[PDB]
């Protein structure tokens, strides 16, 4: 289906560049807010506009609500479908680092990639997306 991982490409005065990455899942395109800042995005003579968004959470969904609801168990490795600018997609298996915040316990990917890689999905062993790279994951069973 249209389900998959997509480069968010942009073109303007700065030529063509990769603004970020997002995921189409259950007819909703998910990415990070700072990537698009709520701008419209084309999908082949078909424009998508924000349905839901949070600046503070830095998350945004086009065409419907945020669909991902699974969390990291805080034990097992995860895989990031890394979509770097100017390189083919790759799966990278890694162990997130647990970090405590006033809002709750959080996991983050220790890997470092260029700017436009943000939004690359993080999967658990079941293939469920538990967060986007550059935004992290939540803890829970």
């Amino acid at each position: 289906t249209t389900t998959g991982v997509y480069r968010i490409m942009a073109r303007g005065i700065l030529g063509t560049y990769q603004a970020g990455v997002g995921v189409m899942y259950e007819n909703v395109f998910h990415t990070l807010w700072h990537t698009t800042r709520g701008a419209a995005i084309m999908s082949g003579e078909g424009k998508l506009t924000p349905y839901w968004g949070s600046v503070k959470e830095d998350r945004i969904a086009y065409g419907g609500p945020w669909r991902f609801d699974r969390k990291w168990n805080g034990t097992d490795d995860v895989q990031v479908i890394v979509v770097e600018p100017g390189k083919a997609a790759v799966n990278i298996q890694t162990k997130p680092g647990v970090f405590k915040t006033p809002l709750g316990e959080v996991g983050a990917v220790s890997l470092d990639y260029p700017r436009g890689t943000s939004g690359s999905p993080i999967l658990d062993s079941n293939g469920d997306i538990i967060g986007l790279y550059g935004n992290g994951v939540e803890l829970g069973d």
Binding site: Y6, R7, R11, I41, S43, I81
Partner: peptide, 21 residues
């Protein structure tokens, strides 16, 4: 001038066994 944003498919959503190996 023109500013546009669009989507370009890069991968399927999937776990890969080889990535573990």
């Amino acid at each position: 001038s023109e500013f546009d944003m669009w989507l370009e498919r890069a991968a399927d959503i999937t776990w890969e066994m080889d990535a573990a190996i």
